[PDB]
Amino acid sequence: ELNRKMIYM
Amino acid sequence: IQRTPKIQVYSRHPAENGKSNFLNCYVSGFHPSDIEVDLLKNGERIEKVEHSDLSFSKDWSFYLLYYTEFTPTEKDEYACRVNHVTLSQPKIVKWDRDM
Amino acid sequence: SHSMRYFDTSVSRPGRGEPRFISVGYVDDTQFVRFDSDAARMEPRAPWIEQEGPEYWDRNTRIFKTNSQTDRESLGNLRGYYNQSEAGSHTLQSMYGCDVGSDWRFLRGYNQNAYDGKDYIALKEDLRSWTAADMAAQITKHKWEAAHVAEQDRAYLEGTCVEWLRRYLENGKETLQRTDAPKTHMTHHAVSDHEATLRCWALSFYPAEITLTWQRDGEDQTQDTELVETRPAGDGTFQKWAAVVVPSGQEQRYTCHVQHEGLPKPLTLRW
């Protein structure tokens, strides 16, 4: 189950 | 960083002439992920070639497996052409039943 | 000890093309899922993931796409930190996941990002703070510290990550909770009238982890040894071999030892 990346580098 | 591919050409099962088997070309340790790989029967590219999904190792370098079904014969010569930005010319790695 | 891992790649194809986005999912050494921006939704690489409903496939596909949009924005930001040209092709890698111990309980979590083959930023082992590799990474670290995103990452890695690993381990038990012990054999290749090469072979094993060591009269040998990278057979098993250069007529003095999870006692090979 993927994690959701919510923030740009 | 750029990294030259390593290549391994081998069979899925011990090669015994006449039984259907799979020719594998495993390219690993390369970076960037753009790369071109062909499987050769006596110089001639095979059409029905598949390949696994793009993944990478602990040092971030990529690896792919290219495979195809065939029947080993003691006369035919199999090999693997790999091109990559780190190579000035395509690399040809012949199959070796002992390897 | 079991693990779940996602390997993510984002390649900024410039001028003609949207970026390329890949995510591969692994339980231990078995691929179970693939997301690809240039595929003609989710393609199940494992039967047991297909047992999950179509809601699972649509949610994960939405997540993947949201992540794609995040990577795209990050690639642009990274291009800016380093004052690079939009005409270049750049690569942004990500690898995250969780390990569990013998009790199927949380043991380790990790979340690492690399830019153009170089370690860019990584979560610490404590999943509390970050490690930057240069000034750009230092900007990301300050942005990410200001937004407290290490909290969410820890949450996922200690929570969702472990729960879904356990579920897949139970649901796909026949593929994931099994070991295939290596089938071994030995080859011989003359180099000269008085040097030869012995090659110790391990075939068709699972998981991929294995230890191949050579002994001369029972003593460990690392001199004049070669150990190739473990390779996949295509059938869910792996192959590996190790070679040693011996004096001609002393081949019997050398033994090969194979240690593997599927072997209560290590195997010994003689020529």
Numbering used by the authors:
A (entry chain C): 1 to 9
B (entry chain B): 1 to 99
C (entry chain A): 2 to 41, 44 to 274
Give sentences from the paper.
The class I proteins of the Major Histocompatibility Complex (MHC-I) present epitopic peptide antigens on the cell surface, thereby enabling immune surveillance of the intracellular proteome by CD8+ T cells and Natural Killer cells (1–5). The heavy chain is comprised of three domains, the α1 and α2 helices define the peptide binding groove in the MHC-I structure, while α3 stabilizes the molecule by creating an extensive binding interface with β2m. We developed a method called ‘CHaMeleon’, to generate synthetic molecules that combine the peptide binding specificity of one allele (template or groove allele) with the TCR binding surface of another (base allele).
We experimentally validated the ability of the designed chimeric HLA to form stable protein complexes with the desired CMV peptide, using in vitro refolding, purification and DSF analysis which revealed a Tm of 49.8°C. Hence, we attempted to solve the structure of HLA-B*08:01-A*02:01/CMV complex in an I23 space group and obtainedcrystals which diffracted to a 2.72 Å resolution. As in the HLA-A*11:01-A*02:01 crystal structure, we observed unambiguous electron densities for the CMV peptide that we modeled within the F0-FC electron density map. Altogether, our peptide exchange data further support that the HLA-B*08:01-A*02:01 chimera can preferably bind epitopes with high affinity for the binding groove of the template allele, namely B*08:01. Our study also describes a chimeric HLA, namely HLA-B*08:01-A*02:01, with no direct equivalent amongst naturally occurring HLAs (15 amino acid differences with the closest allotype).
